Each structure stands twice: as C-alpha cells, then as structure tokens.
CSV table of C-alpha atoms and ligand atoms in Angstrom, one decimal:
chain,number,residue,atom,x,y,z
X,16,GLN,CA,102.0,104.5,87.7
X,17,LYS,CA,105.3,102.6,87.0
X,18,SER,CA,106.5,99.6,89.0
X,19,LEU,CA,109.8,99.2,90.8
X,20,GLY,CA,112.6,96.7,90.5
X,21,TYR,CA,114.0,94.4,93.2
X,22,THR,CA,117.2,94.4,95.3
X,23,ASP,CA,118.7,92.1,97.9
X,24,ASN,CA,119.3,93.0,101.5
X,25,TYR,CA,118.7,90.0,103.8
X,26,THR,CA,118.8,92.1,107.0
X,27,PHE,CA,115.2,93.2,106.3
X,28,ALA,CA,113.9,89.7,107.0
X,29,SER,CA,110.2,90.4,107.5
X,30,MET,CA,107.9,93.4,107.2
X,31,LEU,CA,104.2,92.5,107.8
X,32,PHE,CA,101.3,94.9,107.3
X,33,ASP,CA,98.5,93.9,109.9
X,34,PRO,CA,95.3,95.9,109.3
X,35,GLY,CA,91.9,95.5,110.8
X,36,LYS,CA,89.1,93.9,108.9
X,37,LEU,CA,86.2,96.0,107.5
X,38,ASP,CA,83.1,93.9,108.3
X,39,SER,CA,82.2,94.8,111.9
X,40,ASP,CA,79.7,97.7,112.3
X,41,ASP,CA,82.3,99.6,114.4
X,42,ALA,CA,85.0,99.5,111.8
X,43,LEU,CA,82.5,99.9,108.9
X,44,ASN,CA,81.1,103.2,110.5
X,45,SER,CA,84.5,104.7,111.2
X,46,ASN,CA,86.7,107.1,109.1
X,47,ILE,CA,89.9,105.4,110.3
X,48,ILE,CA,91.5,102.2,109.1
X,49,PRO,CA,93.6,100.8,111.9
X,50,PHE,CA,96.8,98.8,111.4
X,51,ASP,CA,100.0,97.6,113.0
X,52,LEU,CA,103.4,97.2,111.3
X,53,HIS,CA,105.6,94.3,112.3
X,54,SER,CA,109.3,94.0,111.3
X,55,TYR,CA,112.2,91.6,111.9
X,56,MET,CA,115.7,92.9,111.2
X,57,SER,CA,118.7,90.5,111.1
X,58,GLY,CA,121.4,93.1,111.0
X,59,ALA,CA,122.1,96.7,112.1
X,60,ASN,CA,121.1,99.6,109.9
X,61,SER,CA,121.4,103.4,110.1
X,62,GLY,CA,121.0,106.6,108.1
X,63,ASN,CA,118.3,107.8,105.6
X,64,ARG,CA,119.0,105.1,102.9
X,65,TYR,CA,116.1,102.8,103.6
X,66,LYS,CA,112.5,103.8,103.6
X,67,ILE,CA,109.1,102.1,104.4
X,68,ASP,CA,106.5,102.4,101.6
X,69,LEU,CA,102.8,101.6,101.8
X,70,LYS,CA,100.9,101.3,98.5
X,71,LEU,CA,97.1,101.5,98.8
X,72,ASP,CA,94.3,100.7,96.5
X,73,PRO,CA,93.3,103.8,94.5
X,74,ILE,CA,89.8,103.5,95.9
X,75,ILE,CA,91.2,104.2,99.4
X,76,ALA,CA,94.1,106.5,98.4
X,77,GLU,CA,91.6,108.8,96.8
X,78,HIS,CA,90.2,109.5,100.3
X,79,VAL,CA,93.4,109.4,102.5
X,80,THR,CA,94.1,112.6,104.4
X,81,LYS,CA,96.7,111.4,106.9
X,82,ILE,CA,98.6,108.2,107.6
X,83,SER,CA,100.6,107.9,110.8
X,84,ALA,CA,101.9,105.3,113.4
X,85,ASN,CA,103.9,105.2,116.5
X,86,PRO,CA,107.5,104.1,116.1
X,87,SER,CA,108.6,101.0,118.1
X,88,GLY,CA,108.5,101.8,121.8
X,89,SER,CA,107.2,105.4,121.4
X,90,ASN,CA,104.1,107.4,122.1
X,91,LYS,CA,104.6,110.2,119.5
X,92,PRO,CA,103.2,109.3,116.1
X,93,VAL,CA,105.1,109.9,112.8
X,94,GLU,CA,103.2,111.0,109.7
X,95,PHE,CA,103.6,109.3,106.4
X,96,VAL,CA,104.4,111.6,103.5
X,97,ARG,CA,102.7,110.9,100.2
X,98,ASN,CA,105.1,110.2,97.3
X,99,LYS,CA,105.4,112.2,94.1
X,100,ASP,CA,106.2,110.5,90.8
X,101,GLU,CA,108.7,111.6,88.2
X,102,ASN,CA,106.7,114.4,86.7
X,103,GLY,CA,105.0,115.6,89.9
X,104,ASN,CA,101.6,113.9,90.4
X,105,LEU,CA,100.7,112.0,93.6
X,106,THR,CA,101.1,108.2,93.7
X,107,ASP,CA,99.0,105.9,95.8
X,108,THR,CA,102.1,105.1,98.0
X,109,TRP,CA,103.0,106.7,101.3
X,110,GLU,CA,106.6,106.7,102.5
X,111,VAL,CA,108.3,107.0,105.9
X,112,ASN,CA,111.9,106.6,106.9
X,113,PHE,CA,112.9,103.2,108.4
X,114,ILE,CA,115.5,104.1,111.0
X,115,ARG,CA,113.8,105.5,114.1
X,116,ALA,CA,116.6,107.9,114.8
X,117,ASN,CA,116.0,109.6,111.4
X,118,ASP,CA,112.3,110.3,112.0
X,119,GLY,CA,111.5,106.7,111.3
X,120,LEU,CA,109.8,103.7,112.9
X,121,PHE,CA,112.3,101.1,114.0
X,122,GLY,CA,115.6,101.3,115.9
X,123,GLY,CA,118.8,100.6,114.0
X,124,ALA,CA,120.2,98.3,116.7
X,125,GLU,CA,117.0,96.4,117.7
X,126,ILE,CA,117.9,93.3,115.8
X,127,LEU,CA,117.0,89.6,116.2
X,128,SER,CA,113.6,90.2,117.6
X,129,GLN,CA,110.1,91.2,116.4
X,130,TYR,CA,109.3,94.9,116.8
X,131,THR,CA,105.9,96.6,116.1
X,132,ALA,CA,104.8,100.0,115.1
X,133,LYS,CA,101.5,100.4,116.9
X,134,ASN,CA,98.4,102.7,116.7
X,135,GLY,CA,98.6,103.0,112.9
X,136,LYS,CA,95.8,105.2,111.5
X,137,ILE,CA,94.8,105.6,107.9
X,138,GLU,CA,92.7,108.7,108.4
X,139,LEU,CA,90.2,109.1,105.5
X,140,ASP,CA,87.9,112.0,104.5
X,141,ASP,CA,84.9,109.7,104.8
X,142,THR,CA,83.7,106.5,106.5
X,143,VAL,CA,84.8,103.2,105.1
X,144,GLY,CA,81.2,102.1,104.8
X,145,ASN,CA,80.5,104.9,102.4
X,146,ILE,CA,83.5,104.1,100.2
X,147,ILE,CA,82.8,100.4,100.2
X,148,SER,CA,79.2,101.1,98.9
X,149,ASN,CA,80.6,103.5,96.3
X,150,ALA,CA,83.4,101.2,95.0
X,151,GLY,CA,81.6,98.5,93.1
X,152,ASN,CA,81.7,94.7,93.2
X,153,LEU,CA,84.6,93.7,95.5
X,154,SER,CA,84.2,90.0,94.7
X,155,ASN,CA,87.0,89.9,92.1
X,156,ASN,CA,88.9,93.2,92.5
X,157,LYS,CA,89.8,93.7,96.1
X,158,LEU,CA,91.1,96.7,98.1
X,159,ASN,CA,94.7,95.9,97.5
X,160,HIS,CA,97.6,97.0,99.8
X,161,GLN,CA,101.3,96.5,99.7
X,162,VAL,CA,104.3,97.3,102.0
X,163,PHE,CA,108.0,97.0,101.4
X,164,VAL,CA,111.4,98.5,102.3
X,165,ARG,CA,112.8,100.8,99.5
X,166,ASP,CA,116.5,101.2,98.9
X,167,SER,CA,116.5,104.9,98.1
X,168,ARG,CA,120.1,104.7,96.7
X,169,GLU,CA,119.0,102.4,93.9
X,170,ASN,CA,115.2,102.9,93.9
X,171,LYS,CA,114.5,99.2,94.3
X,172,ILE,CA,112.3,97.1,96.5
X,173,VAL,CA,114.1,95.0,99.1
X,174,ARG,CA,113.1,91.5,98.1
X,175,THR,CA,112.7,89.9,101.5
X,176,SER,CA,110.6,92.8,102.9
X,177,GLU,CA,107.7,92.7,100.4
X,178,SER,CA,104.3,91.8,101.7
X,179,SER,CA,100.9,92.4,100.1
X,180,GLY,CA,97.3,91.4,100.5
X,181,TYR,CA,93.9,93.1,100.6
X,182,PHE,CA,91.5,94.5,103.2
X,183,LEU,CA,88.7,92.1,104.0
X,184,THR,CA,85.1,93.2,103.3
X,185,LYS,CA,81.7,91.4,103.6
X,186,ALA,CA,82.3,90.4,99.9
X,187,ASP,CA,85.0,88.1,101.3
X,188,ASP,CA,82.4,86.2,103.4
X,189,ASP,CA,84.3,83.0,103.6
X,190,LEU,CA,87.6,84.5,104.9
X,191,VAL,CA,85.7,86.9,107.2
X,192,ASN,CA,83.9,83.9,108.7
X,193,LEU,CA,87.1,82.2,109.9
X,194,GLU,CA,88.5,85.4,111.6
X,195,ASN,CA,85.2,85.5,113.6
X,196,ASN,CA,85.2,81.9,114.7
X,197,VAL,CA,88.9,81.4,115.4
X,198,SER,CA,89.9,78.0,116.8
X,199,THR,CA,91.2,77.5,120.3
X,200,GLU,CA,94.0,75.0,119.6
X,201,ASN,CA,96.8,77.5,119.5
X,202,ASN,CA,95.5,81.1,119.8
X,203,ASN,CA,98.8,82.0,121.4
X,204,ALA,CA,101.3,80.7,118.9
X,205,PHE,CA,101.4,83.3,116.1
X,206,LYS,CA,101.4,87.1,116.0
X,207,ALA,CA,100.5,87.9,112.4
X,208,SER,CA,100.7,86.6,108.9
X,209,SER,CA,101.0,88.2,105.5
X,210,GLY,CA,101.6,87.0,101.9
X,211,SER,CA,103.6,88.0,98.9
X,212,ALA,CA,103.4,87.1,95.2
X,213,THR,CA,106.1,87.5,92.6
X,214,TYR,CA,106.9,86.2,89.1
X,215,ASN,CA,109.7,83.7,88.6
X,216,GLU,CA,110.9,82.8,85.1
X,217,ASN,CA,112.9,79.8,86.3
X,218,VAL,CA,109.8,77.8,87.2
X,219,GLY,CA,109.0,75.0,84.8
X,220,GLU,CA,109.0,75.6,81.1
X,221,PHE,CA,106.8,78.8,80.9
X,222,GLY,CA,107.8,80.6,84.1
X,223,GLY,CA,105.9,80.6,87.3
X,224,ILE,CA,104.3,82.5,90.2
X,225,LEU,CA,105.5,82.2,93.8
X,226,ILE,CA,103.3,82.8,96.7
X,227,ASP,CA,105.4,83.1,99.9
X,228,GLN,CA,103.3,83.3,103.0
X,229,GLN,CA,105.1,84.1,106.3
X,230,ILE,CA,103.7,83.6,109.8
X,231,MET,CA,105.4,85.4,112.6
X,232,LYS,CA,105.8,83.5,115.9
X,233,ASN,CA,104.8,84.9,119.3
X,234,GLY,CA,107.3,82.5,121.0
X,235,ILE,CA,109.0,79.2,120.1
X,236,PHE,CA,106.1,77.2,118.7
X,237,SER,CA,106.6,73.5,118.0
X,238,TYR,CA,104.1,71.4,115.9
X,239,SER,CA,103.4,68.0,117.4
X,240,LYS,CA,99.9,66.6,117.0
X,241,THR,CA,98.4,63.1,116.9
X,242,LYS,CA,97.3,61.7,113.6
X,243,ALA,CA,93.6,62.4,114.5
X,244,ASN,CA,94.4,66.1,115.4
X,245,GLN,CA,96.6,67.0,112.4
X,246,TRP,CA,96.0,70.5,110.9
X,247,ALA,CA,95.4,71.3,107.3
X,248,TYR,CA,96.8,74.0,105.0
X,249,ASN,CA,94.1,75.8,103.0
X,250,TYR,CA,94.9,77.9,99.9
X,251,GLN,CA,92.8,79.8,97.4
X,252,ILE,CA,94.2,80.8,94.0
X,253,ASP,CA,92.7,83.6,91.9
X,254,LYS,CA,90.1,82.1,89.5
X,255,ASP,CA,91.3,84.7,86.8
X,256,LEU,CA,94.6,82.7,86.5
X,257,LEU,CA,93.4,79.1,86.1
X,258,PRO,CA,93.4,79.3,82.2
X,259,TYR,CA,97.2,80.0,82.5
X,260,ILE,CA,98.1,77.5,85.2
X,261,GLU,CA,99.6,74.1,84.3
X,262,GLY,CA,99.9,72.9,87.9
X,263,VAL,CA,100.2,74.0,91.5
X,264,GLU,CA,102.8,72.6,93.9
X,265,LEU,CA,103.6,73.1,97.6
X,266,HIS,CA,107.3,73.9,98.4
X,267,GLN,CA,109.3,74.0,101.6
X,268,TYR,CA,110.1,77.5,102.9
X,269,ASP,CA,112.7,77.2,105.6
X,270,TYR,CA,113.7,80.2,107.7
X,271,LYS,CA,117.5,79.7,107.5
X,272,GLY,CA,118.4,81.3,110.8
X,273,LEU,CA,120.0,84.7,110.5
X,274,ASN,CA,119.7,84.5,106.7
X,275,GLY,CA,115.9,84.4,106.8
X,276,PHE,CA,114.1,83.1,103.8
X,277,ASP,CA,115.8,82.1,100.5
X,278,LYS,CA,113.7,83.9,97.9
X,279,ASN,CA,115.0,81.9,95.0
X,280,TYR,CA,113.1,79.1,93.4
X,281,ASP,CA,114.4,75.5,94.0
X,282,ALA,CA,112.5,72.7,92.4
X,283,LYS,CA,114.2,70.3,94.9
X,284,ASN,CA,112.1,71.9,97.7
X,285,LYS,CA,108.8,70.6,96.3
X,286,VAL,CA,107.0,68.4,98.9
X,287,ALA,CA,103.5,67.9,97.4
X,288,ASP,CA,101.2,68.4,94.4
X,289,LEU,CA,98.3,70.6,95.4
X,290,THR,CA,94.8,70.1,94.0
X,291,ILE,CA,92.3,72.9,93.3
X,292,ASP,CA,88.6,73.1,92.3
X,293,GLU,CA,86.9,75.4,89.8
X,294,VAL,CA,86.9,78.5,92.1
X,295,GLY,CA,90.6,78.1,92.8
X,296,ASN,CA,90.3,76.7,96.4
X,297,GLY,CA,92.0,73.7,97.9
X,298,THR,CA,93.4,72.0,101.0
X,299,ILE,CA,96.1,69.6,102.0
X,300,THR,CA,96.9,67.6,105.1
X,301,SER,CA,99.0,64.6,106.2
X,302,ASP,CA,99.5,62.2,109.2
X,303,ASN,CA,102.4,64.5,110.1
X,304,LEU,CA,102.2,68.1,108.8
X,305,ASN,CA,105.9,68.5,109.6
X,306,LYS,CA,106.5,66.8,106.2
X,307,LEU,CA,104.9,69.7,104.3
X,308,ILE,CA,105.6,72.8,106.5
X,309,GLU,CA,109.0,73.7,107.9
X,310,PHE,CA,107.6,75.0,111.2
X,311,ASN,CA,111.1,75.7,112.6
X,312,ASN,CA,110.1,73.7,115.7
X,313,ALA,CA,111.3,74.9,119.2
X,314,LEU,CA,112.9,78.0,117.4
X,315,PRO,CA,111.7,81.6,117.3
X,316,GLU,CA,111.9,81.6,113.5
X,317,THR,CA,109.2,82.9,111.3
X,318,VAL,CA,107.1,80.1,109.7
X,319,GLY,CA,107.0,80.1,105.9
X,320,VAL,CA,104.9,78.4,103.3
X,321,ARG,CA,105.6,78.6,99.5
X,322,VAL,CA,103.0,77.8,96.8
X,323,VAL,CA,104.2,77.6,93.2
X,324,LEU,CA,102.0,78.2,90.1
X,325,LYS,CA,103.6,76.6,87.0
X,326,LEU,CA,102.2,78.3,83.9
X,327,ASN,CA,101.2,76.6,80.6
X,328,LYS,CA,101.8,79.7,78.4
X,329,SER,CA,104.2,82.6,78.6
X,330,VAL,CA,103.2,85.1,81.2
X,331,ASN,CA,102.9,87.8,78.6
X,332,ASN,CA,99.8,86.0,77.3
X,333,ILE,CA,97.7,87.3,80.2
X,334,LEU,CA,97.5,91.1,79.5
X,335,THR,CA,97.7,90.4,75.8
X,336,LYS,CA,94.6,88.2,75.7
X,337,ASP,CA,91.9,89.7,73.4
X,338,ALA,CA,94.5,92.0,72.0
X,339,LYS,CA,95.0,93.0,68.3
X,340,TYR,CA,97.9,92.7,65.9
X,341,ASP,CA,98.7,94.2,62.5
X,342,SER,CA,99.4,92.7,59.1
X,343,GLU,CA,103.0,91.8,60.0
X,344,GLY,CA,101.8,90.3,63.3
X,345,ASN,CA,103.2,93.1,65.5
X,346,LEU,CA,101.4,94.3,68.6
X,347,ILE,CA,99.8,97.7,68.7
X,348,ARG,CA,100.6,99.4,72.0
X,349,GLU,CA,97.0,100.7,72.3
X,350,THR,CA,95.2,97.3,72.5
X,351,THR,CA,96.9,95.5,75.5
X,352,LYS,CA,95.9,95.7,79.1
X,353,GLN,CA,98.2,98.0,81.2
X,354,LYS,CA,97.4,96.8,84.8
X,355,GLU,CA,95.8,93.7,86.3
X,356,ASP,CA,96.0,92.5,89.9
X,357,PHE,CA,95.5,88.9,91.2
X,358,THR,CA,94.6,88.0,94.7
X,359,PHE,CA,95.5,84.9,96.8
X,360,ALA,CA,95.1,83.7,100.4
X,361,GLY,CA,96.4,80.9,102.6
X,362,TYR,CA,95.7,79.8,106.1
X,363,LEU,CA,95.8,76.9,108.5
X,364,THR,CA,92.8,75.1,110.0
X,365,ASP,CA,92.6,72.7,112.9
X,366,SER,CA,90.9,69.2,113.2
X,367,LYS,CA,87.4,70.6,113.1
X,368,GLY,CA,88.2,73.1,110.4
X,369,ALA,CA,88.5,76.4,112.3
X,370,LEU,CA,91.2,78.9,111.6
X,371,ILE,CA,94.3,79.0,113.9
X,372,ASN,CA,94.7,82.5,115.3
X,373,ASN,CA,96.5,85.0,113.1
X,374,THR,CA,97.3,82.5,110.4
X,375,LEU,CA,95.4,84.1,107.5
X,376,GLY,CA,97.8,85.8,105.1
X,377,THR,CA,96.5,87.3,101.8
X,378,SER,CA,98.7,88.4,98.9
X,379,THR,CA,98.3,90.3,95.7
X,380,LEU,CA,100.3,90.0,92.5
X,381,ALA,CA,100.4,93.3,90.5
X,382,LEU,CA,101.2,92.5,86.8
X,383,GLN,CA,101.9,95.7,84.8
X,384,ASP,CA,102.8,96.6,81.3
X,385,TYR,CA,103.8,100.3,81.7
X,386,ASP,CA,104.9,101.0,78.1
X,387,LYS,CA,102.2,98.6,76.7
X,388,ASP,CA,104.6,96.7,74.4
X,389,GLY,CA,103.1,93.2,75.3
X,390,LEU,CA,105.8,92.4,77.7
X,391,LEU,CA,105.2,92.6,81.5
X,392,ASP,CA,107.5,95.0,83.5
X,393,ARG,CA,108.6,92.1,85.6
X,394,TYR,CA,109.5,90.1,82.4
X,395,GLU,CA,111.6,92.9,81.0
X,396,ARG,CA,113.5,93.5,84.2
X,397,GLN,CA,114.2,89.9,85.0
X,398,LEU,CA,114.6,88.1,81.7
X,399,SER,CA,114.7,90.3,78.6
X,400,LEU,CA,116.8,93.0,80.2
X,401,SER,CA,115.0,95.8,78.3
X,402,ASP,CA,113.8,99.2,79.4
X,403,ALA,CA,110.4,98.9,81.1
X,404,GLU,CA,109.4,102.4,80.0
X,405,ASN,CA,110.4,102.2,76.4
X,406,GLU,CA,108.6,100.5,73.5
X,407,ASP,CA,111.9,100.4,71.6
X,408,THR,CA,115.0,100.1,73.9
X,409,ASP,CA,117.6,99.9,71.2
X,410,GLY,CA,115.9,102.4,69.0
X,411,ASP,CA,115.7,100.5,65.7
X,412,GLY,CA,112.0,100.9,65.0
X,413,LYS,CA,111.3,97.3,66.2
X,414,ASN,CA,109.1,97.2,69.3
X,415,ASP,CA,110.4,95.2,72.3
X,416,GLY,CA,107.4,92.8,72.3
X,417,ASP,CA,107.5,92.2,68.6
X,418,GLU,CA,111.3,91.8,68.7
X,419,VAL,CA,111.1,89.0,71.2
X,420,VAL,CA,108.2,86.8,70.1
X,421,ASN,CA,107.8,87.7,66.5
X,422,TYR,CA,111.1,88.8,64.9
X,423,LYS,CA,113.1,86.5,67.3
X,424,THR,CA,115.9,89.1,67.3
X,425,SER,CA,117.6,90.8,70.3
X,426,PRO,CA,115.7,93.8,71.7
X,427,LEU,CA,119.0,95.3,72.8
X,428,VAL,CA,121.0,95.6,69.5
X,429,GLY,CA,120.3,98.1,66.8
X,430,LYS,CA,123.4,97.8,64.5
W,28,CA,CA1,115.1,76.6,110.1
W,29,CA,CA1,106.5,96.3,78.8
W,30,CA,CA1,110.1,97.8,76.9
W,31,CA,CA1,114.1,97.4,69.1
W,32,CA,CA1,117.0,95.0,68.3
C-alpha cells in the first residue's frame, strides 16, 4: 500500500510497457491481456540487484492468475512472481529479475539498442469484458498500470525507467478512435510510446508536475515537413487537477546521447505556453515543429516531450480538500484522502489530424498519503525529509503536517 522512493541509474534509459487495447471484440472476449516490454540500456549490468516491477490496477490484479513473457531473443517464457509487502499480504505489483542470465528478461551486455520481451500474457481468471462491466464508470478512474526498474539493494525506483499509463477501454472513445484510424504519414518511424508523471518541488512557486513522454524510434527518423504539412502535438490533462494548476508549459526534452534524458527540471528549457480548454485538452503546432520538439533528427535516439504543470497552491492541498481540522487548526489523520490517481495523455497528429503510428503515450500520477498526515509521500521524501510512514517523525507529539504548515517548526527536531 506504501509508495517507493527514487534512485538514479542512467543506464536504464527507457522501459516501455506496450499493452494491447481493450475495445475490439477479440480482446474484449479474451481472458488474456497481451503486452510487449521494450527496454533501452546504456551500460552493462549483471547480477540479481535490479528487478522489473509491474504494478496493475486493483480491478485487474484481483483477477490475475499468471503473468509471463519471453525474455529478449528466447522462446521459453518466464513467470512474474507476485510481491509480498512488509507484513505478508499480496501487493498489486508483480516482479521479475532484469538480467536474463539470472532468470530475467534482458541480456546484461545487449546495450545501445532497443530490445523487446515479447508474447507477454496477463492471464486472468475471467474475460476482460466481464471485469470491465463489473468495474464501474471508467471515464475518470482508469485501469492504471505502471512499470519500472527496482534497485533491490536500496528499495528505490530507478528514475529514468519509470513509465505508466492506463489500458484503453470504450470509455476512452476519443483515444481509441485515433488508434483505429492511424495516419499514413510515418507509420514506420516509431516503435512504441509511454508516459510518466512525477512531482517536482522546484517548479515555479508552489511546485509542479512533470509529464515526460518518450517515443522510441524504429530507425533514425528525421522531422522535415513543409509549412502546410506540419504536425501538431496534442495533450490532455486530467480535469481533476485544473483547480490546482496555475499554468501549463511545453519544455524541451533532449535525449543526451549515452546519458539519455535529464530528469531534472530546468526552466530554461521552456519553449512554449500551452493552452487548454475546460475538459483539459489542447494542441500546439508551428511552422517548424523542430522548434518545440527535440526529435534528435537523423539519430537513433528516443524522442522525448515534457509538459510542466505549475501549481497555484501547495500540492498537499489536493488530498486535504474537504478535510477537517481541530480547535488548534491541526489535521486529524482520519479525514484526509489516502490515495488519488491522475491520468494524462499525449500524442502527435498529422496535417489532417490523424494519429502518427505508435505515438500515443498515456501516464498516471499516483499521489499518496500513506500515514495520512496531510503531506504527500512524495512531498515528505523530496522536500520535508520526514518519515513517510510516521505521523510524528521526531516523536514530540506534533504531527508532521501540523508541524510544517501550522506550527512552522521543524518536523525533524524534538529537543
Ligand atoms: Ca540529442
Ligand atoms: Ca504523509
Ligand atoms: Ca510523515
Ligand atoms: Ca514532530
Ligand atoms: Ca519537531
């Protein structure tokens, strides 16, 4: 139930989760969710240190009986083992070793090239159509999924390997439309695309949210179009976040060769101000899209696009909306939200407005308040430096949330 911190290993440059959509009658009537797993590794690795984790929506994890996939270049599948939490229950995350030689998926020496784990099967105890019809309204809450590399030595997520998103259903009618009428302009250029959403306290004056969409290249694509054939970048932000957003910007996201993507925020990389409507959708174009997207022309580098959400209030005001306080103004741990997920999506359209093949990348941002002290887990780990599973880190009777916003005293000192 508790979230994980982040660590830094640039060698795990990309890790994309590519699942099938769930709208066609063939997929809707099957008990198996198919997927491929793409990875790019910039340096050699070995041993049992690093793992591959796959966190699934609890609606689906309730029905999962087996998860498996073929390692890169193999015919024999490997089974994902379900994870057990601290006390012994089963999480909604399955885990497999990374290095192929240690019952994993990818070879420790296959670097500087895209490698795929194919024939991935999420075997369920029921057909997906039955679960979709017994899951509720999937127009706001989606069937979230997440994949990342885990450093088992420090129990942290490798920052550059995180990728999230959600499975497409018929409730996502707009997105499902574009993956059925794909454009013909460059159906060969790109392999797959996934997104990732994180919280960043250095953005603006109240913190920010970073949406980093990567698009893997099949070859060495180069973007050169006439002014009348210029593409457009289309984005959709979760409507549940608009009250808290001061503004949205488009940043450059350069794949810096062997170093991959720089995950840090840099306000100097802003290239445009994005406009959005009431439902959270928007689009942007130019007479030369090379101004707004670092396509890494003529190079086999992954294409990246960064969207920044500058908040107008502190991020802790999201789960603490319609919460209750006492006479002294302190938060009662039993009134604030504990979990809430937000969904985003980004994709490229051609001149007529059709999707470029495998350019749709969805992302989910999982905000969590495990100890329910009013401070998000990401806030405590990245800014306040307090224990994410303790209402009172220093042990002086003053809760962590009350100590930071109310008492204005350090939540780390008790004497
Ligand atoms: Ca570059
Ligand atoms: Ca907390
Ligand atoms: Ca805490
Ligand atoms: Ca305290
Ligand atoms: Ca204190």
